[PDB]
RNA sequence: GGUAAAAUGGCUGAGUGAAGCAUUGGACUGUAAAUCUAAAGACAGGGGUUAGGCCUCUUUUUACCA
């Protein structure tokens, strides 16, 4: 068979803050991905993108923002269940998916291979690519540019010409003749002989485009007029068609090169990516968001907008496609920009919505309570980000000067940012310790996408260093150790702290916790195992005011959670099912929302908060009945104080009318 | 919400083009059941490759998701 009919060049990251650089080209035969941060597991299975048949995966750089998001491509395809799969990459990044599976668990089922540096040519039966390693003075040294190539296209035949003359058109006696004119040698017929191109267009080599990822100047020398480029700038078998530009503002700006680029010649395209892109991709995110603003604007904040040199460029945005063979030129008919006029229209207008809404601010039209005790909850979902479900981080800011976290995970930065605003920057500072309830990937894996940009953060402002606190079990040190040792300098921002020593009964360690005690004004601190999994731990925070919290988590009922738990004002517990089936409880080893209503119950606290859900199926929560207004359902980007619970029990009716159908677990 | 198998008629087996059971008048049979020389409904709804078999976007059915 010949070369594909038709190719497409899709961007996936669109140079986001939130993100590093990602590229997704679309083939006739194959699916290939170039670079991946955190948050593309939304932005791919959010506008449709096919998980399957991405049996090869391209990166570049060993930085977080580009090598982050592996694991969940890893897991996705386990659960798709790709028979095999191809990774390539810098020649030391075997070590990444070796301490994959240290947490992970064994990827045994789906066969992933690797390929070194001495083999810088891979082709295949529809494109072709090129790596050229880089090594620059100042592993982060080595970025190994990338370069495409496409099999030749064979021009259509004229099979109406055939016919016209009086060829055995429509029958089996045609087939040889168009093969044989397919390999390019002449057949004579009739007494006369016809030329190739009379019977066909001439053929087309095919196009190309070039990737690169110059960061800083460091890289500009070892590339500067690199000699796999001199056999290619300027004419070549065909012109470049398309290309992208990596590298920051600053670097384009440089009176040093910016004219190397010109000598591909101007038919060749150029296109930049950065953080200065408007982007505002989230339109039903943000549209979801808006309508909770507007059945409470103070329970529920607002994402706030993130908003926007010798021949021209095409700014990158969302959705930007590109069409190489039909024909060389853009397209912008996928276009995600917000429309909150148009999302006003259909959240002012739902059936029965705005008579529950008005009769809930008619109700609602106990003294002042504390101003800033605070509990943020970013992310509802489990192990999986959705449209509106992610892994939760549940942040917690008990005094504006110090902040603490309630586990993390990925994309949880992506969703402070375009809701801190201006006050990102600060709200990073204030952080002061992290810590992680038990080994699950997606409870631990978004810690170094937080620990990188609080390290510009604290810079931002001309303050001291202050190396951040983390509390994780004993396995959590190895994959960290291995990452300093493997791809970037860690350890000085992370300071480990065993969950045992914290247990009831149980000089560093206790300066430590001191220390952390004392910053954030926490009277006591302490931690017990759960009903879980292997060194599953809780936690517990007692404030000198008398205010308890205890968060639980993924657990099943056990009474050191209960005995803990006594005289908590809040409380967090996790849910699977609402009602449904009680057996296979150690599938899941986790709790059931029943019983976790009839703990809060005979918990003796005032409010319990639903926070974790299991997303094996898309559906609202169901809430289960026979309950009080102590529990309550948990979404993402919460807020309020520490006083603020009358107001909830209210937005139960408006919150049930906002969804209307309802989508949960039937027959099928 | 995601993954896996089929969209051909009253039913099924496939991709050179379509075939058996059944029927419209019945021939051997007083009798309408046996055996045909003719008949028919015909590959879900769009398009990219210029041909069906390939891929792409909804629609129906079944199963699975830690
Ligand atoms: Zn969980
Ligand atoms: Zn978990």
Redo the contacts with the bound molecule.
Sequence with gaps: SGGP??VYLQVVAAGSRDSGAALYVFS?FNRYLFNCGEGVQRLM?EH?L????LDNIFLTRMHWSNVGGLSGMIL?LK???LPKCVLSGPPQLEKYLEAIKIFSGPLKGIELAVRPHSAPEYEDETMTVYQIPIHSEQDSSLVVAFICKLHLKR???????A?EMGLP??T?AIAPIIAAVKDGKSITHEGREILAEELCTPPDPGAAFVVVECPDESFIQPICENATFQRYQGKADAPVALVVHMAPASVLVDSRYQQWMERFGPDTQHLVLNENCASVHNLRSHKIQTQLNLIHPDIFPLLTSFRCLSVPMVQGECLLKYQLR?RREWQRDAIITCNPEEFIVEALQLPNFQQSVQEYRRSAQAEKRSQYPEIIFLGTGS?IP??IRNVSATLVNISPDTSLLLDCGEGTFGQLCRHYGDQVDRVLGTLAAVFVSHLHADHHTGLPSILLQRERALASLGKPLHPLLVVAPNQLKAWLQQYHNQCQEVLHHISMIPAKCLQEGAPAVERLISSLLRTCDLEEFQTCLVRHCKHAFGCALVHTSGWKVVYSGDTMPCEALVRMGKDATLLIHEATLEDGLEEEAV???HSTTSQAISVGMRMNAEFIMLNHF?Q????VPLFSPNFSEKVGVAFDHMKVCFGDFPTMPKLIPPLKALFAGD?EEM??
């Design positions: 009919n038709t006739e299975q449709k096919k998980v399957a048949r996705t659960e798709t269940g021009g259509n035949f004229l099979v109406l010409k016919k058109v429509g089996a039909p192990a959705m449209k599938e899941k080893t299991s094996r199926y898309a559906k989508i027959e099928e």
